[PDB]
Design a protein around this motif. Sequence first.
Motif, PDB file in Angstrom:
ATOM      1  N   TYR A 166      24.061  54.446   9.958  1.00 44.35           N
ATOM      2  CA  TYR A 166      24.456  53.492  11.204  1.00 44.35           C
ATOM      3  C   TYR A 166      23.207  52.638  11.536  1.00 44.35           C
ATOM      4  O   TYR A 166      22.377  52.756  12.234  1.00 44.35           O
ATOM      5  CB  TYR A 166      24.562  54.407  12.292  1.00 44.35           C
ATOM      6  N   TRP A 167      23.194  51.732  10.549  1.00 47.70           N
ATOM      7  CA  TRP A 167      21.941  50.705  10.524  1.00 47.70           C
ATOM      8  C   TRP A 167      22.206  49.889  11.811  1.00 47.70           C
ATOM      9  O   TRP A 167      23.216  49.331  12.124  1.00 47.70           O
ATOM     10  CB  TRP A 167      22.186  49.800   9.267  1.00 47.70           C
ATOM     11  N   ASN A 168      21.064  49.800  12.408  1.00 47.17           N
ATOM     12  CA  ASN A 168      21.110  49.187  13.830  1.00 47.17           C
ATOM     13  C   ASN A 168      21.971  49.451  14.800  1.00 47.17           C
ATOM     14  O   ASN A 168      22.495  48.815  15.368  1.00 47.17           O
ATOM     15  CB  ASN A 168      21.291  47.464  13.370  1.00 47.17           C
ATOM     16  N   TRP A 169      22.284  50.736  14.823  1.00 50.15           N
ATOM     17  CA  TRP A 169      23.244  51.313  15.655  1.00 50.15           C
ATOM     18  C   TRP A 169      23.036  51.000  17.036  1.00 50.15           C
ATOM     19  O   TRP A 169      24.060  50.530  17.771  1.00 50.15           O
ATOM     20  CB  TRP A 169      23.163  52.869  15.325  1.00 50.15           C
ATOM     21  N   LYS A 170      21.980  51.145  17.572  1.00 52.87           N
ATOM     22  CA  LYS A 170      21.489  50.831  18.869  1.00 52.87           C
ATOM     23  C   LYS A 170      20.179  49.653  18.868  1.00 52.87           C
ATOM     24  O   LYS A 170      19.951  49.478  17.476  1.00 52.87           O
ATOM     25  CB  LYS A 170      21.084  52.017  19.757  1.00 52.87           C
ATOM     26  N   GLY A 171      19.974  49.246  19.914  1.00 52.76           N
ATOM     27  CA  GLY A 171      18.698  48.679  19.855  1.00 52.76           C
ATOM     28  C   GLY A 171      17.473  48.743  19.256  1.00 52.76           C
ATOM     29  O   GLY A 171      17.537  49.715  18.229  1.00 52.76           O
ATOM     30  N   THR A 172      16.291  48.373  19.321  1.00 58.87           N
ATOM     31  CA  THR A 172      14.948  48.561  18.756  1.00 58.87           C
ATOM     32  C   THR A 172      14.141  49.743  19.491  1.00 58.87           C
ATOM     33  O   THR A 172      13.349  50.155  19.060  1.00 58.87           O
ATOM     34  CB  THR A 172      14.152  47.300  18.782  1.00 58.87           C
ATOM     35  N   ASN A 173      14.732  50.215  20.654  1.00 57.94           N
ATOM     36  CA  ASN A 173      13.978  51.304  21.325  1.00 57.94           C
ATOM     37  C   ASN A 173      14.612  52.493  21.044  1.00 57.94           C
ATOM     38  O   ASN A 173      15.826  53.041  21.095  1.00 57.94           O
ATOM     39  CB  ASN A 173      14.487  50.989  22.930  1.00 57.94           C
TER      40      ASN A 173
END
Length: 245
Positions: free
Chosen positions: A164-171
């Motif tokens: 799940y690449w870049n599934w959620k933000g950078t946090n």
Amino acid sequence: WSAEDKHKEGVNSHLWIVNRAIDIMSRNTTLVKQDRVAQLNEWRTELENGIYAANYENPYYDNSTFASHFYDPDNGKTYIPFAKQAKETGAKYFKLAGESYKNKDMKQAFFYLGLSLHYLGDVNQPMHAANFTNLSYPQGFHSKYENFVDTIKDNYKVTDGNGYWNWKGTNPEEWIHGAAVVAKQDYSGIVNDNTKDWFVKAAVSQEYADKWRAEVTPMTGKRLMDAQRVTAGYIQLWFDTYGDR
Ligand SMILES: CCCCCC(=O)OC[C@H](CCP(=O)([O-])OCC[N+](C)(C)C)OC(=O)CCCCC
Ligand SMILES: [Zn+2]
Ligand SMILES: [Zn+2]
Ligand SMILES: [Zn+2]
């Protein structure tokens, strides 16, 4: 999940999840820089130490209460009032690992990443996202379930390169919370009147022992596969964040 042996997947579901996530990265030939996998394997000893340490020493296991290994996404709390939870703790080590990495202290960086991966791994276990501990009723179900998982996990390996690449933000906190949300949804697929009933009767009847094991298998397979994909994306995020750029 279990983490009985520091370097053996046989009785360490946490290590297994991470290794399978690394395999996902290795299989990906369109996005992942393979030197990242080389680094993980170069500092595997420290990484595995971190994954293991979370369950055996302070401050990681909170005086043997493991309060920081739980996180309920609905109220953002662990099972003990005012104690630290998995989201803030996992994010803490993700950042500490990154600072060490930027300062070229690889041993410190990968040990901390290992710790962070442990917490991320735990919120993928439905019980951990619902504050169901080994003391919750039926008492002992939590640990027996995680021990059972080690016997069947190898049947649910993800065999493609789609994490799940870049599934959620950078946090990192968003990733831990997001995983807990999905895991809690699958909670009833493991803990319900049926599995509770059979687990209790399993004490005297092997017949019932096989019943609850079978009942929770499908959902367990789904949780394990999700955990692999999310972990791969989490590791990729860590490198994109601290790996120069
Ligand atoms: C005296 C027997 C100890 C068993 C404790 C246990 O199974 O803990 C599982 C998780 C621990 C987090 P995890 O990563 O899923 O740990 C699994 C493995 N292990 C407990 C062996 C370290 O924590 C709790 O349920 C809290 C209550 C503890 C009751 C004494
Ligand atoms: Zn665990
Ligand atoms: Zn557990
Ligand atoms: Zn844990």
